[model samples]
Target: YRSINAADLYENIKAYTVLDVREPFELIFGSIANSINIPISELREKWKILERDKKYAVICAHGNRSAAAVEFLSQLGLNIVDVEGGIQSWIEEGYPVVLE
Candidate 1:
């Protein structure tokens, strides 16, 4: 599995697809703009909808859940990476986030 830091992602945000695994309620605080939400709880049943050819950067509140998600996806032959430190890290890095 691959891992990427928020700073690196921030610099090339447009070049990757982001899979947000946080719940909808968490989104009320803030989220990466245009990232797709598929809460971790529902990810197992919903992951098939994702495109196998696209590289995904999976994220959650912190990093734990995303690590799990990335591992699962990787096992399924999907190209996915864990976003180290997750969304919280992204915001802490001053990356643009939208409040919903």
Candidate 2:
């Protein structure tokens, strides 16, 4: 797993499989478009459903959980990475987030 900043993430957003490891309630603020939701707590088992060959770009509220998930998932050989500043950075940078 690796880290990427929000700016770089936005630029190549379409090229990666976006995963949002946030609780449903937290998403009330906003979220990136086309990002799949899989709360961190369930990922230990749910992770198997993901493809090892795909480039997964993950995000969380403030970035901590995303980084943690990346480290844990990477050990299992999946191609996953974290957004350094999470969705907070994206919102702070005035990047687009879907309201629905």
Q: What lDDT would each prediction earn against the true structure?
A: 0.89, 0.89
Q: How many angstroms is residue 60 displaced in model 1 relative to the true structure, after the best TM-score fit?
A: 1.2
Error of 1 at 48 (Å): 0.8
lDDT tens string, model 1, 1-100?
A: 9999898887778888889999899988998888899998999999989998787889888999999998899999998889998898888877888986
Tens-digit per-residue lDDT, 1-100, candidate 2 = 6898888988998888889999988887798998888999999879988887788999998998998899999999988889978899899999999976
Clashing pairs in 1: none
Scanning candidate 2 in windows of ten residues, the lowest lDDT window is 25-34
> By TM-score, how accurate is candidate 2?
0.94
Predicted structure 1, TM vs. truth: 0.95
